[PDB]
Design a protein around this ligand. Structure first.
Ligand SMILES: [Zn+2]
Ligand SMILES: [Zn+2]
Lengths: 63, 146, 78, 77
């Protein structure tokens, strides 16, 4: 639980769970999981976290 | 594939699960070796089971190829170490990391599907004489995994 | 809940749940569904190398306070 | 006391901390494990990064570095 371990966990939390490189930027509708970037999303028909069908993808901005 | 594979390796080093271990073979990040420890209070207890992992170049969009090298007695794993398991095929998810795949396989050991088996003879024994199944799986653990 | 346990989610994030020693596995999955949005039918919980079955309790598996359960996706051998 | 710390995880999830040197052999580590945990060396299997570790090699030989985690697997007793 060091300051670096906490900063890393906050950065990993914001990061795409597929490529693990770019920040998340797309929310799946209707399951609501925010887990991929815009480069990984076009390849996906089901949510990688809950296997829900993806009916739409909204570009999200954490202001 | 490489960058994600390196991240998984680093993420493992920080905190691997108790049940498994994995890393590259030699200088090749696409070919790993892994261990699954047999679950306590199972016929596999005390066993250390080795596996090969081959990441394809389009990992993680396609699943890794995973097979046992240690022989193991199970309805869904054959004598060649092939694992018939839906998450290694049509039910793959790109968010599954190698650690979760190994834990998933470990959880298959005491949760076989004898109704759609890879090794029919083993599945019939599992369904009709569980003490015989357990005895044989214990014997193979002793012979191959210790 | 009267004690705490930990769940390592699919992405490796560790969450804390408040549970009872006699909580059923399905109740644990319902708590995960509320915190992480995963349908219970897609949750596979693993402790000590073994999957936890609905209808059983934490005490059935000797899951104690501050145990860590590992969450993976529903799977089926074949 | 030690040049670097490594961690040893048991099947129950308990992690122990060891003070080691990169030149320490796997045999040395098993002796330190017996000191901390009371497990005799001949009952210990050590695993790192998917490999079972051989007694005569060093931590450095296996790419074990500071804060690396090894697995302690007991032989069926
Ligand atoms: Zn991505
Ligand atoms: Zn989802």
């Amino acid at each position: 639980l060091s300051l670096e371990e906490q900063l890393r966990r906050l950065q990993e939390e914001r990061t795409c769970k597929v490529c693990m490189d770019k920040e998340v930027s797309v929310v799946f509708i209707p399951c609501g999981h925010l887990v991929v970037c815009q480069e990984c999303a076009p390849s996906l028909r089901k949510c990688p976290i809950c296997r829900g069908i993806i009916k739409g993808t909204v570009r999200t901005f954490l202001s | 594939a490489l960058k994600r594979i390196h991240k998984e390796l680093n993420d493992l080093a920080r905190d691997p699960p108790a049940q498994c271990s994995a890393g590259p073979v030699g200088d090749d990040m696409f070919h790993w070796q892994a261990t699954i420890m047999g679950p306590n209070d199972s016929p596999y207890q005390g066993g250390v089971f080795f596996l090969t992992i081959h990441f394809p170049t389009d990992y993680p969009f396609k699943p890794p190829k995973v097979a046992f090298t240690t022989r193991i007695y199970h309805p869904n794993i054959n004598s060649n170490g092939s694992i018939k398991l839906d998450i290694l095929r049509s039910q793959w998810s790109p968010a599954l990391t190698i650690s979760k795949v190994l834990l998933s396989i470990c959880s298959l050991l005491c949760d076989p599907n004898p109704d759609d088996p890879l090794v029919p003879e083993i599945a019939r024994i599992y369904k009709t004489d569980r003490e015989k199944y357990n005895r044989i799986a214990r014997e193979w653990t002793q012979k191959y995994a210790m | 809940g009267s004690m705490q346990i930990f769940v390592k989610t699919l992405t490796g994030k560790t969450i804390t749940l408040e549970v009872e020693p006699s909580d059923t596995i399905e109740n644990v999955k319902a708590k995960i569904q509320d915190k992480e949005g995963i349908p219970p039918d897609q949750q596979r919980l693993i402790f000590a190398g073994k999957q936890l079955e609905d209808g059983r309790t934490l005490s059935d598996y000797n899951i104690q306070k501050e145990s860590t359960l590992h969450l993976v996706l529903r799977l089926r051998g074949g």
